[PDB]
Coordinates of C-alpha atoms in Angstrom, one line a residue:
Chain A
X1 CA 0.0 0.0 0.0
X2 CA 3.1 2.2 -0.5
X3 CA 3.9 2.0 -3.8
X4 CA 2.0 5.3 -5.0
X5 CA 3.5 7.1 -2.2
X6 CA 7.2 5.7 -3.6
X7 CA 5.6 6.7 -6.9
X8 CA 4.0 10.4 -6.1
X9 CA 7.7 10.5 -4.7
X10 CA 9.5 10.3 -7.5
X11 CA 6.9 12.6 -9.2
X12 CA 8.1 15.3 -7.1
X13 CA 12.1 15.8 -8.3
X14 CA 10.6 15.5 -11.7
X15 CA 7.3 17.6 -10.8
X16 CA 10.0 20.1 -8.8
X17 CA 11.7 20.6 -12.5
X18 CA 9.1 22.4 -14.0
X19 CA 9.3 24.8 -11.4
X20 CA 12.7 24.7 -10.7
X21 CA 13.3 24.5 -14.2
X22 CA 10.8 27.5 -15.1
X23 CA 12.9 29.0 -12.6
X24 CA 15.6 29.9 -14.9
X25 CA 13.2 30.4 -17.5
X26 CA 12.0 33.4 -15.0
X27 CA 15.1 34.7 -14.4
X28 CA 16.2 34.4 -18.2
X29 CA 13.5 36.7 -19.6
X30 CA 13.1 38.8 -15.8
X31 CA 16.3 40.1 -16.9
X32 CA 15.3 41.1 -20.3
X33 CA 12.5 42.2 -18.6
X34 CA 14.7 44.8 -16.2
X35 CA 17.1 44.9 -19.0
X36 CA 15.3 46.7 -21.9
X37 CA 13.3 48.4 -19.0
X38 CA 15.8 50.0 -17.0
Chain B
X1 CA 1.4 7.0 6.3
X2 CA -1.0 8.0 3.3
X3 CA -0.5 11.8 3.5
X4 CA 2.6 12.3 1.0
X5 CA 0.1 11.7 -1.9
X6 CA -1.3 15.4 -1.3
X7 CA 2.4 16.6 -0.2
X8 CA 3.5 15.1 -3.4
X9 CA 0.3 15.8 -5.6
X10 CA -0.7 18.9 -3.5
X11 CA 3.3 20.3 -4.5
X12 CA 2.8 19.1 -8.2
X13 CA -0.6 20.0 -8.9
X14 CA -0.3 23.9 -7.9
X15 CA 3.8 23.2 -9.6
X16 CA 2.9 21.7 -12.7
X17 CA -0.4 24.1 -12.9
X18 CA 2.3 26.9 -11.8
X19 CA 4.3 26.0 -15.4
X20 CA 2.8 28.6 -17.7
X21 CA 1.2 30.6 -15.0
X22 CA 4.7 32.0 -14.8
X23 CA 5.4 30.8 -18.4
X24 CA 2.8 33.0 -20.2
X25 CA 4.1 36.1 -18.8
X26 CA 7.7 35.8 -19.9
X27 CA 6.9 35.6 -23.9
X28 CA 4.5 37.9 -23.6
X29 CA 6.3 40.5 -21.9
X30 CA 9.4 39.5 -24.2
X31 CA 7.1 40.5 -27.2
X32 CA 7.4 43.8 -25.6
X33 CA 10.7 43.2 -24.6
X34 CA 11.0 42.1 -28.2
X35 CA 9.3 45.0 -29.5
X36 CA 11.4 47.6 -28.2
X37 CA 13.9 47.0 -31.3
X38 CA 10.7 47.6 -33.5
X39 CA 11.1 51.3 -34.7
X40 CA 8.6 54.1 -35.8
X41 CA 8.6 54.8 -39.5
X42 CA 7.3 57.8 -41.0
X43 CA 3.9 58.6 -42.3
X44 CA 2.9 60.5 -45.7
X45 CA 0.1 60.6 -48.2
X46 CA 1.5 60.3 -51.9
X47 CA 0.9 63.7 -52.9
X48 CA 1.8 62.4 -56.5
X49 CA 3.9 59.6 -58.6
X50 CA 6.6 61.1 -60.4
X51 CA 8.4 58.1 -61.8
X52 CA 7.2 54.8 -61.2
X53 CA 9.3 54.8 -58.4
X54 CA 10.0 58.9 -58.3
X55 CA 6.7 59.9 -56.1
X56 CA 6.1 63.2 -55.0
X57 CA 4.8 63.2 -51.3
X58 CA 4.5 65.7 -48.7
X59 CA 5.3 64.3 -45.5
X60 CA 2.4 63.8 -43.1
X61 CA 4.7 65.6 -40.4
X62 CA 6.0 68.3 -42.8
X63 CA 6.9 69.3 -46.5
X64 CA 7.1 67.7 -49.5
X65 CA 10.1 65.2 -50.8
X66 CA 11.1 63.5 -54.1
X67 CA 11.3 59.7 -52.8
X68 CA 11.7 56.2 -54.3
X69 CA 9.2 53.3 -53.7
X70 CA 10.6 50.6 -51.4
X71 CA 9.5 47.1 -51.5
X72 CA 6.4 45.3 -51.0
X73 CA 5.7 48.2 -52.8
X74 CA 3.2 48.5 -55.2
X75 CA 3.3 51.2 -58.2
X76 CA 0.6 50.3 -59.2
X77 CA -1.0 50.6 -55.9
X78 CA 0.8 53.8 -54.9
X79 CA -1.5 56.9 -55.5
X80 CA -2.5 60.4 -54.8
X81 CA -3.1 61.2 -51.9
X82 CA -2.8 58.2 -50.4
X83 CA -1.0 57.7 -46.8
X84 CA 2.6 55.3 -46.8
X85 CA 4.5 54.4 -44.3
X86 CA 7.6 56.8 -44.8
X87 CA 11.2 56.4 -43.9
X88 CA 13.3 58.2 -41.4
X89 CA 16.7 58.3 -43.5
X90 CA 16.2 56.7 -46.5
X91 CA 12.7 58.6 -46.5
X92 CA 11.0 56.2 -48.9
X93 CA 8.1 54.4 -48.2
X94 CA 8.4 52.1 -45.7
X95 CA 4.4 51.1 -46.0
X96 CA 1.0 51.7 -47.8
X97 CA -1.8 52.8 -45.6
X98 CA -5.1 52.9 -45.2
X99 CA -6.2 56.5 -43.8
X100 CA -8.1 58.6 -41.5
X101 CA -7.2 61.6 -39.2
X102 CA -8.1 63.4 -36.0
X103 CA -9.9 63.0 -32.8
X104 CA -13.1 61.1 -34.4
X105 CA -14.8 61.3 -30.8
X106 CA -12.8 64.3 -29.6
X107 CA -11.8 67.0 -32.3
X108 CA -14.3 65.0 -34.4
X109 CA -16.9 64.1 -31.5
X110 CA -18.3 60.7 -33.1
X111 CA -21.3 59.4 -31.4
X112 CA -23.6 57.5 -32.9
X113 CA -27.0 58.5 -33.4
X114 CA -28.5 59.8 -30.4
X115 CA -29.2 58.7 -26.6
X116 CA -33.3 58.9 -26.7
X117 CA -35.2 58.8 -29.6
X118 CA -37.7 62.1 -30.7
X119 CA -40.7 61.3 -28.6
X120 CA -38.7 61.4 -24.9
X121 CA -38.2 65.6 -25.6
X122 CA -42.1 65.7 -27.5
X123 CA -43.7 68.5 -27.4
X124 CA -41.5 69.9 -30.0
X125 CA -43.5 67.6 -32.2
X126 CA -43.9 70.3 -34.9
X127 CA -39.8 70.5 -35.3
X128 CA -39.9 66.7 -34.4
X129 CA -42.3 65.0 -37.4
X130 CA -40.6 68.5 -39.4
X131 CA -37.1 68.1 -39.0
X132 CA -37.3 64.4 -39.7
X133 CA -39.3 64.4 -42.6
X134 CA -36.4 66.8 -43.6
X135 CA -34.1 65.0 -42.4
X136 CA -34.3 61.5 -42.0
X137 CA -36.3 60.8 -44.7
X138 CA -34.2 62.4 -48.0
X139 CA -32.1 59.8 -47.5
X140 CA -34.6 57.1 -48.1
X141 CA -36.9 58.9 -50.8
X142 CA -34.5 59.4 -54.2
X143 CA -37.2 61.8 -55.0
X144 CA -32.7 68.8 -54.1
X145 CA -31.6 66.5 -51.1
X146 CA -31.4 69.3 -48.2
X147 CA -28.9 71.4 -47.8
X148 CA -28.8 72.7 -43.7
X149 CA -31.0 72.8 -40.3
X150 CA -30.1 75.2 -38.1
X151 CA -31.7 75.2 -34.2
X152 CA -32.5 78.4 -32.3
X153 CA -33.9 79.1 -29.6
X154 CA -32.6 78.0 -26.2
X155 CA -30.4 75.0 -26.1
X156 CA -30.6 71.7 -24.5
X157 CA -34.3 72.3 -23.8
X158 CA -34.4 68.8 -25.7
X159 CA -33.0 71.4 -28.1
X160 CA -29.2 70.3 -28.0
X161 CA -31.4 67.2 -26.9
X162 CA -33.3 67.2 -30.3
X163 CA -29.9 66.3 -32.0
X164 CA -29.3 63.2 -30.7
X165 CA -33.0 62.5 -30.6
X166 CA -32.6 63.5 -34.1
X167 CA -29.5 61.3 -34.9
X168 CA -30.9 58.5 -33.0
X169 CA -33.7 58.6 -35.7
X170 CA -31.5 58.4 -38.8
X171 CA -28.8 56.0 -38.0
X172 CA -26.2 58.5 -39.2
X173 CA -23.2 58.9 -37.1
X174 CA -24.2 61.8 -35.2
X175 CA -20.5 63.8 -35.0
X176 CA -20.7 66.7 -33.0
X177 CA -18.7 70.3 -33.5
X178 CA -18.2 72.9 -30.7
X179 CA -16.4 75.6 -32.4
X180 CA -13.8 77.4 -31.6
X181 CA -11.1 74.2 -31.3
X182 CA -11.7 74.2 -34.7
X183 CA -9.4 77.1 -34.8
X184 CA -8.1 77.9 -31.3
X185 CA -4.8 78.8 -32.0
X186 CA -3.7 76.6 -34.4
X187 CA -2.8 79.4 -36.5
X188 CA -4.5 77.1 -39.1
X189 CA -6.4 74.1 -39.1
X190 CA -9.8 74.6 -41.3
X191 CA -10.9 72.6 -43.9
X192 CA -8.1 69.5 -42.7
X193 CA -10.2 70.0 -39.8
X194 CA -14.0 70.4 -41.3
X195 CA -13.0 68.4 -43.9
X196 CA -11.7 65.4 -41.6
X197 CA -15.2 66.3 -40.2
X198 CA -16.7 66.4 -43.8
X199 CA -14.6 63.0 -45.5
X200 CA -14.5 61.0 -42.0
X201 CA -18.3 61.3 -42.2
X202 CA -18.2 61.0 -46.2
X203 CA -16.5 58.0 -46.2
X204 CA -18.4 57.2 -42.8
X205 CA -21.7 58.2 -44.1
X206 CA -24.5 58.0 -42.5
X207 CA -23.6 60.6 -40.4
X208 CA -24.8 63.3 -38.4
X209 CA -22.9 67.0 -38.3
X210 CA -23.8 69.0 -35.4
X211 CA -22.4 71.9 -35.1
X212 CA -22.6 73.6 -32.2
X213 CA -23.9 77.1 -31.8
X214 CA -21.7 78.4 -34.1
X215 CA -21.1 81.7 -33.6
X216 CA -17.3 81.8 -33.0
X217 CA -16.7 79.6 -36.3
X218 CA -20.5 81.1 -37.6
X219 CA -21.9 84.2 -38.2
X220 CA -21.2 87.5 -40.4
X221 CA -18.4 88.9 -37.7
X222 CA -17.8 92.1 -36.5
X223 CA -16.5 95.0 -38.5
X224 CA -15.4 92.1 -40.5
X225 CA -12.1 93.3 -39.9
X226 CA -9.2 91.0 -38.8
X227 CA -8.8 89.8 -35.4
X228 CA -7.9 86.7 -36.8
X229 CA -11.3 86.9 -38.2
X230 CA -9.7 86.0 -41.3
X231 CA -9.1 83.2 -39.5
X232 CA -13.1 83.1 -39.0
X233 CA -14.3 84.0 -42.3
X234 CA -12.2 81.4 -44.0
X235 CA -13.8 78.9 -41.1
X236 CA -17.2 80.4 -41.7
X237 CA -16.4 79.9 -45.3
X238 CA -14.8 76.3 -45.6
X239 CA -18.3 74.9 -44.7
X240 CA -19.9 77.8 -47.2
X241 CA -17.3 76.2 -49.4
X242 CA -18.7 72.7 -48.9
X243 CA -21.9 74.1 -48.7
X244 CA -22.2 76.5 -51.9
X245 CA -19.5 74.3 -53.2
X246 CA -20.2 71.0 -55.1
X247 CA -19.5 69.2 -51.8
X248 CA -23.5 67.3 -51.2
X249 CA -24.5 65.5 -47.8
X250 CA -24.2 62.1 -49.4
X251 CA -25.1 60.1 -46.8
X252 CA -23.5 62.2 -44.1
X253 CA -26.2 65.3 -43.0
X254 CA -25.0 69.0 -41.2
X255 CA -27.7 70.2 -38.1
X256 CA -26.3 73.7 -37.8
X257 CA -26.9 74.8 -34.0
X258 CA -27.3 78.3 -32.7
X259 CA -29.7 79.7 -29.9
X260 CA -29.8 82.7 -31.4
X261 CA -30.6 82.6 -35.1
X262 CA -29.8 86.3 -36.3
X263 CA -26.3 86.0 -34.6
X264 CA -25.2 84.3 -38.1
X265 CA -24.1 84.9 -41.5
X266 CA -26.9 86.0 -44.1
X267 CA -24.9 84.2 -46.6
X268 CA -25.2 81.2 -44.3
X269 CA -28.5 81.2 -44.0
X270 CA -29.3 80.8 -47.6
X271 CA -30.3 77.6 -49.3
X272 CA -27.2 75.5 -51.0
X273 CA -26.2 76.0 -47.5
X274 CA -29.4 75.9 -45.6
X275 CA -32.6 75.1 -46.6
X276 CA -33.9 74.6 -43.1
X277 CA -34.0 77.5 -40.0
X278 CA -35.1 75.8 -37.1
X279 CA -37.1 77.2 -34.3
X280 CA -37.5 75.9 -31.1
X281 CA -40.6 78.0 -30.1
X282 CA -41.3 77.5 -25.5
X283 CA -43.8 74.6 -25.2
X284 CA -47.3 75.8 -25.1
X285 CA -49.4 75.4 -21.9
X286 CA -50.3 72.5 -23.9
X287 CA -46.8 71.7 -24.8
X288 CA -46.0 72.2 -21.4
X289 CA -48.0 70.2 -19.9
X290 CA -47.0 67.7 -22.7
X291 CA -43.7 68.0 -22.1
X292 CA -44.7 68.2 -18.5
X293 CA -46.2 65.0 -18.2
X294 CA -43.0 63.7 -20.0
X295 CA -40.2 64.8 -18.6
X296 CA -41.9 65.6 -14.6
X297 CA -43.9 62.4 -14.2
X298 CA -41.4 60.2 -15.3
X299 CA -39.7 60.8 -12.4
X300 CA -41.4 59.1 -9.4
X301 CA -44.2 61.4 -8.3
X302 CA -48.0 60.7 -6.7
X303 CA -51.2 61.4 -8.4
X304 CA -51.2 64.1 -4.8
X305 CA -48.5 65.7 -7.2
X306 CA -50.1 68.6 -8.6
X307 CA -50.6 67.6 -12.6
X308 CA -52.2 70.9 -14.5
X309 CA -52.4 73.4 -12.2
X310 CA -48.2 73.3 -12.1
X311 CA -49.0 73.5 -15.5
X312 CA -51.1 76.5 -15.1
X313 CA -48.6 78.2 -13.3
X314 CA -46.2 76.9 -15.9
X315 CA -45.8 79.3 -18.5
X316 CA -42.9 80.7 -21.0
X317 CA -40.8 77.9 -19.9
X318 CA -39.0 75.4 -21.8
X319 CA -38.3 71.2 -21.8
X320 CA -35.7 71.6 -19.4
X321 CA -37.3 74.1 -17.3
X322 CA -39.6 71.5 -17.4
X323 CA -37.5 69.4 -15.2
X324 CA -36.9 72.0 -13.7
X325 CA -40.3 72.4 -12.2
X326 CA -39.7 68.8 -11.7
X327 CA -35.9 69.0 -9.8
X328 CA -36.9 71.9 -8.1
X329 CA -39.3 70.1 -6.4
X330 CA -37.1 67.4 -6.2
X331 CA -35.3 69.6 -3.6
X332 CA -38.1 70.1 -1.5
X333 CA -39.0 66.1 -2.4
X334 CA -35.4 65.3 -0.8
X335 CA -36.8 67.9 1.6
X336 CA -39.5 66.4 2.3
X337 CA -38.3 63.4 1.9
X338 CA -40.2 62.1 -1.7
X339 CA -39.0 59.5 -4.2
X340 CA -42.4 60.1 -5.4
X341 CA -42.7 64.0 -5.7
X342 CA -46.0 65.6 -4.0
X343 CA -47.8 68.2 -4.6
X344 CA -46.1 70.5 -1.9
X345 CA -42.9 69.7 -3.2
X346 CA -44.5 71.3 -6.7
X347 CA -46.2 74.5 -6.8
X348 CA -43.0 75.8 -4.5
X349 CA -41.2 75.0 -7.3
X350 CA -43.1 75.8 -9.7
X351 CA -43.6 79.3 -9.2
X352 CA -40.2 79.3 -7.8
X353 CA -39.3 78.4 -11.2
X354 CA -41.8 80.8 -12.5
X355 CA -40.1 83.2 -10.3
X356 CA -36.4 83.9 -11.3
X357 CA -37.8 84.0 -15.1
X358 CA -41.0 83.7 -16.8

């Protein structure tokens, strides 16, 4: 009765990529965005 | 043991939802981001082709150049008159427009037709059906289209009223002119202007022209001297020149306003410019209590409130004095305390508002 929870775990490092990947996508264009800005 | 689903699916769910919640915003603003490299490029109307390429065109911003086509450019296309896209340096075309100029709501007021319809302001039924028929109706009968309709009398008494009520009856854009910004100072700015006003509306026809109480930009002037009044004249005169000129109300139709009719240009007056003076006579005690009826009881009142005999004391006034009668008692209603006006609130009023005038 654990597997999902072994499963929904490894979701997260994955799931945690999009966000921590997006991350860098914010920052990539959040400096274009201050750049051309400021 | 079982919670970590929700700590795992309660992180990914908002996480993976979060993606483009975040994601959206970057390319969009980098379009703008983006769009700060794309640059402004000059505007101009083709004032003529010299050469298939060679065009003569006075720049939309200033005076005129000798330029060269550019690409996407069509020579064929490329015409008098008509408005490019203009370079900064090379100062070729760097476009072909489409066209249209000025404040169309502000300089140009552009609203179309009117807010209520004729019979909300009736008891100026004569001008009403008469103005219409007019009006209105030229348009649909084949079988001289009119020339002008000029108000007097006092305004707004459904009288400015009348023209919306009048260009809520046509379907015409109704396109409103106070005057003076038509020449305020501006050294210049007269037939760009009234003809913006005039070819706006002639390509926009139906419309409406309503110019307003023109006596800055109307009437004969003064010792017709110069003040500027040369300024004037030519103003008073650009619409004489569409007017007396070939220049027709195709679609698009000129109310001329004044509130006092004698306050204007003889030459004006005449037909080819206008074939309509329009008077806006006070309501009789009828019309009064016509309008009465219309504009006072339409706001909440009893049958206590005192119908006729306001209107006996009602005399020489006009729609709005009307609702006058009506929001003067409407301060002793909120007074007295009356959504519904009585008849106390009234005859205050009323002779109260016969008092300062007639």
């Amino acid at each position: 009765m654990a597997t999902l929870e072994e499963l929904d775990a490894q979701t997260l490092p994955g799931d945690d990529e999009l966000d921590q990947e997006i991350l860098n996508l914010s920052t990539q264009e959040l400096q274009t965005r201050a750049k051309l800005l400021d | 043991k079982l919670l970590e689903h929700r700590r795992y699916d309660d992180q990914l769910k908002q996480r993976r939802q979060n993606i483009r919640d975040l994601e959206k915003l970057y390319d969009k603003t980098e379009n703008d981001i983006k769009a700060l490299q794309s640059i402004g490029q000059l505007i101009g109307e083709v004032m003529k082709e010299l050469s298939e390429e060679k065009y003569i065109v006075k720049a939309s911003s200033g005076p005129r150049y000798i330029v060269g086509v550019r690409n996407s450019v069509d020579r064929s296309k490329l015409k008098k008159g008509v408005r490019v896209t203009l370079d900064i340096t090379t100062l070729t075309i760097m476009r072909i427009l489409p066209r249209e100029t000025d404040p169309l709501v502000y300089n140009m007021t552009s609203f179309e037709q009117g807010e209520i319809t004729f019979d909300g302001i009736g008891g100026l039924t004569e001008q009403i059906r008469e103005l219409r028929e007019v009006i209105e109706l030229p348009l649909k009968n084949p079988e001289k289209p009119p020339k002008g309709v000029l108000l007097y009398g006092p305004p707004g008494t459904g009288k400015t009223l009348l023209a919306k009520a009048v260009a809520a009856t046509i379907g015409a854009n109704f396109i409103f002119s106070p005057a003076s910004g038509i020449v305020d100072k501006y050294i210049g700015e007269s037939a760009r202007i009234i003809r913006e006003m005039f070819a706006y509306a002639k390509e926009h026809e139906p419309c409406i022209i309503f110019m307003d109480e023109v006596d800055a930009i109307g009437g004969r002037r003064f010792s017709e001297g110069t003040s500027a009044d040369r300024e004037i004249q030519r103003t008073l005169m650009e619409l004489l020149t569409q007017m007396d000129g070939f220049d027709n109300l195709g679609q698009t139709k000129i109310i001329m306003a004044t509130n006092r009719p004698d306050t204007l240009d003889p030459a004006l007056l005449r037909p080819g410019r206008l074939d309509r003076k329009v008077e806006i006579p006070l309501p009789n005690e009828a019309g009064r209590l016509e309008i009465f009826k219309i504009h006072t009881a339409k706001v909440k009142k009893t049958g206590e409130f005192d119908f006729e005999a306001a209107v006996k004391m009602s005399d020489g006034f006009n729609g709005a004095d009307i609702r006058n009668c009506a929001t003067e008692a409407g301060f002793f209603a909120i007074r007295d305390d009356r959504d519904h006006i009585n008849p106390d609130d009234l005859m205050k009023a009323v002779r109260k508002v016969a008092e300062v005038k007639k």
